[PDB]
Amino acid sequence: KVFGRCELAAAMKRHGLDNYRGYSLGNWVCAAKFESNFNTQATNRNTDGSTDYGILQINSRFWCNDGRTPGSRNLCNIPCSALLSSDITASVNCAKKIVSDGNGMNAWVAWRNRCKGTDVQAWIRGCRL
Numbered sequence: 001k002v003f004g005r006c007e008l009a010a011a012m013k014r015h016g017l018d019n020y021r022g023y024s025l026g027n028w029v030c031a032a033k034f035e036s037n038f039n040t041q042a043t044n045r046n047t048d049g050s051t052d053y054g055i056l057q058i059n060s061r062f063w064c065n066d067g068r069t070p071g072s073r074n075l076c077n078i079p080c081s082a083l084l085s086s087d088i089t090a091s092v093n094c095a096k097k098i099v100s101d102g103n104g105m106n107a108w109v110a111w112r113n114r115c116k117g118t119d120v121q122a123w124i125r126g127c128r129l
Contacts (some may be wrong), residue, residue: 001086003038003055005029006127008088013129015092021099025129026120027111028095032056033123034110040091041084054083054091056108063094 003011009029012018018025035057036042044052050061050069060069064080076094083091098107105111 001040008032008038009124009127011088023105026123027105027115029123030115030120031108031111034114035108040086053080055088056091056095058083058094
């Protein structure tokens with residue numbers, strides 16, 4: 001499912017991400033835009049052999065089980081395929097854990113390079129929230 005900007009904003013807010021761990025909604029929407037272009041089915045493979053999955057591009061080396069990333073962890077305790085669903089609950093539950101891990105949103109490389117320090121408020125402009 002390719003989410004619409006405001007559509008996602010609403011879903012994220014509903015799932016308790018606005019101001020989660022001190023990060024305003026604009027940060028979460030900007031991170032999704034740059035990580036997957038709002039596509040829940042996005043997948044990207046890394047050189048280490050791990051893969052990133054979904055809307056938030058969560059990594060198989062540490063967060064989910066994809067059965068093909070030897071010696072990796074499954075901190076979110078879910079199969080990576082669960083992160084590709086049209087329903088973002090699993091992706092959100094897992095993101096909450098990641099963001100609380102010590103590095104904040106820096107865990108998302110697109111966030112650090114394209115969202116961090118920008119006017120993230122722009123990503124929620126005109127949305128009925």
